[PDB]
């Protein structure tokens, strides 16, 4: 994502700095998103949702 | 307690502890607190570090062993 930097880096350019061919980098993004998906870790972020 | 009926999802355990929980299928933390340490070591493939982490995750939210609930869930 683009937090605290002017991008928006993409998977190949990300995995360059981690030496992954973008597949493990996809997996790592997915794992972090799943971890933050948990309640008791994202109740505030839930409140930020508007609906 | 309402959090005892919270599953092992909010427990925030490992993937291995999730393997063990699926192998046992203990849904609520209040049913699991009813069990003891050697009783948890009865489970296969779940070792000393596993029960150590389980005691840690129980000490996080005031959970522990020996609490025998009734009329649960």
UniProtKB/Swiss-Prot annotation, chain B:
Chain positions with N6-acetyllysine modification: 48-49
The record's account of how the chain is modified after translation: Acetylated on Lys-48 and Lys-49 in the presence of glucose. PatZ controls acetylation of Lys-49 but not of Lys-48.
Annotated region described as Alpha C-terminal domain (alpha-CTD), given as residue ranges: 1-73
Positions of modified residues (ADP-ribosylarginine): 16
Record text on subunit structure and interactions: Homodimer. The RNAP catalytic core consists of 2 alpha, 1 beta, 1 beta' and 1 omega subunit. When a sigma factor is associated with the core the holoenzyme is formed, which can initiate transcription. Both the N- and C-terminus interact with different regions of transcriptional regulator CRP. The rRNA transcription and antitermination complex (rrnTAC) consists of RNAP, NusA, NusB, NusE (rpsJ), NusG, SubB, ribosomal protein S4, DNA and precursor rRNA; S4 is more flexible than other subunits.
Family to which this protein belongs: Belongs to the RNA polymerase alpha chain family.
Main function: DNA-dependent RNA polymerase (RNAP) catalyzes the transcription of DNA into RNA using the four ribonucleoside triphosphates as substrates. This subunit plays an important role in subunit assembly since its dimerization is the first step in the sequential assembly of subunits to form the holoenzyme. Part of the processive rRNA transcription and antitermination complex (rrnTAC). The complex forms an RNA-chaperone ring around the RNA exit tunnel of RNAP. It supports rapid transcription and antitermination of rRNA operons, cotranscriptional rRNA folding, and annealing of distal rRNA regions to allow correct ribosome biogenesis.
Domain comment, as recorded: The N-terminal domain is essential for RNAP assembly and basal transcription, whereas the C-terminal domain is involved in interaction with transcriptional regulators (such as CRP) and with upstream promoter elements.
Name assigned to this protein: DNA-directed RNA polymerase subunit alpha
Organism annotation: Escherichia coli (strain K12)
Primary gene name: rpoA
Covered range of the whole protein: 250 to 322 of 329
């Amino acid at each position: 994502f683009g937090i605290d930097m002017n991008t928006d880096y993409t998977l190949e350019e990300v995995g360059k700095q981690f030496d992954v061919t973008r597949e493990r980098i996809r997996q790592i993004e997915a794992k972090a998103l799943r971890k933050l998906r948990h309640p008791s870790r994202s109740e505030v972020l839930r409140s930020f949702l508007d609906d | 307690d309402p959090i005892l009926l919270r599953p092992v999802d909010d427990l925030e355990l490992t993937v291995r502890s999730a393997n063990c929980l699926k192998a046992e299928a203990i849904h609520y933390i209040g049913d699991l607190v009813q069990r003891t340490e050697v009783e948890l070591l009865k489970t296969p493939n779940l070792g000393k570090k596993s029960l150590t982490e389980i005691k840690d995750v129980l000490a996080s939210r005031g959970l522990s062993l020996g609490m025998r609930l009734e009329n649960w869930p």
